[PDB]
Design a protein around this nucleic acid. Sequence first.
DNA 1: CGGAAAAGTATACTTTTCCG
DNA 2: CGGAAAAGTATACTTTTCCG
Length: 56
Amino acid sequence: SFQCSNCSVTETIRWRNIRSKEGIQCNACFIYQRKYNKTRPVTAVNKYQKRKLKVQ
DNA sequence: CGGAAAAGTATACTTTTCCG
DNA sequence: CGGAAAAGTATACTTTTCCG
Ligand SMILES: [Zn+2]
């Protein structure tokens, strides 16, 4: 176990330290940044439709 | 007030390393 | 030398806010 370089929560449902230099222990900083860094992959949107296809 | 897009967190699949 | 297990990586999928 390590720590995030922004969050800091030992109980990480799924880590992301990625042996390199920094240690993004959390899954929030990397995955949430999808839209906050650039154009989030439309892949997650394609399945997102699963909700939008039921009611609209 | 409702729906659409943003957002967020878990999970599913995958990989990398260690040890029998 | 290969299997196993946890971390890694990103999409999946449901909720919420906000504007039409
Ligand atoms: Zn973080």
